[PDB]
Design a protein around this ligand. Structure first.
Ligand SMILES: [Fe+3]
Ligand SMILES: [Fe+3]
Ligand SMILES: [Fe+3]
Ligand SMILES: [Fe+3]
Ligand SMILES: [Zn+2]
Ligand SMILES: [Zn+2]
Lengths: 191, 191
């Protein structure tokens, strides 16, 4: 470290901040479309990813010490589509970020004496890979019609009321809260 | 209207989207700092303004029909300070936006045959003026020490539990929910 002011890293941070800020918005918009599309678990993961982008941007933004600063950079100009498409566009952009943008940025940060920032750019990359992974599995189940249907009987959980259900597919309506299949997910345990 | 692709308006929308996306983040960060600073009513108004920026950005973003698109533009590189400073930086940026950026953008939109977009840029400007107004009155009370103290006895409301209190100043603790003065605001009626 030292001072960012005038460095290339300084513009890289702002550019990342600008792209991650926009990603938060798009993921929130993508989450609202997934809810409309009937994918509540996917809606909440967009919303979760949005929130996690907010936190990536926050860490970066706190690096800056400065005033206004001009950046040249390209950004998706649109667009909000169907959920599958939203998930793939999201995946693609996460992809460029972790395979391209952040590795470079990291490099230069490193290569300007900003190794902490360097670490942070690499660390966010990790998150972005998982984000990608996640978006892709979900796109694939949507593609393979396996969101609400699996080939062996398994357990599904109602996200709305916690009702658990044994079967190959989620129910068309929660016996407990009477919410529709959209609220069902594969029951998972991570503790 | 017609098609945005290649227009100057197209880059203006993305640039606005990019600046408004960043504003959402900064206002959310500014809201978290106001909560820490002991200004809960001001925290929630940052959060409210953040949310309203999300909605300005959403309307704009929905205009785009496109792919990647390069923009040159300047953005605050930082910073998160004390609440007063956050409120003034916010005011300044809202100021530039409604007096400068959006009037121009509107003009060109107009002047490219995009009059609906034109209307939207002018309409957002209105919101941004109120946003400014709001931030400025709050900065002024913080400046004049009148956040939690007024010169005549008046009524204060606990934002946490609704408890209402008659006095020149808010109480140091809510008699009802036992939360601190930070949660108090001037009682208001807008219905
Ligand atoms: Fe990500
Ligand atoms: Fe249920
Ligand atoms: Fe505003
Ligand atoms: Fe109270
Ligand atoms: Zn991110
Ligand atoms: Zn706005």
């Amino acid at each position: 470290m030292k001072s960012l002011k005038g460095s290339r890293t300084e513009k890289n941070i702002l550019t990342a901040f600008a792209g991650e800020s926009q990603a938060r918005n798009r993921y929130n918009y993508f989450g609202g479309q997934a809810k409309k599309d009937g994918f509540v678990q996917i809606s909440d993961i967009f919303a979760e990813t949005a929130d996690q982008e907010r936190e990536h941007a926050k860490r970066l933004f706190k690096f800056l010490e400065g005033g206004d600063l001009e950046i040249v950079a390209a950004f998706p100009a649109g667009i909000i589509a169907d959920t599958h498409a939203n998930l793939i566009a999201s995946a693609a952009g996460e992809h460029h970020e972790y395979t391209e943008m952040y590795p470079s940025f990291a490099r230069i940060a490193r290569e300007e004496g900003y190794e902490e920032i360097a670490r942070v750019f690499a660390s966010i990359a990790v998150a972005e890979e998982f984000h990608e992974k996640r978006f892709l599995d979900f796109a694939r189940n949507i593609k393979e019609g396996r969101v609400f249907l699996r080939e062996q009987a398994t357990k599904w959980r109602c996200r709305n009321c916690g009702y658990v259900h044994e079967g190959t597919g989620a129910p068309e309506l929660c016996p407990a809260c009477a919410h529709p299949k959209a609220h069902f997910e594969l029951l998972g345990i991570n503790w």
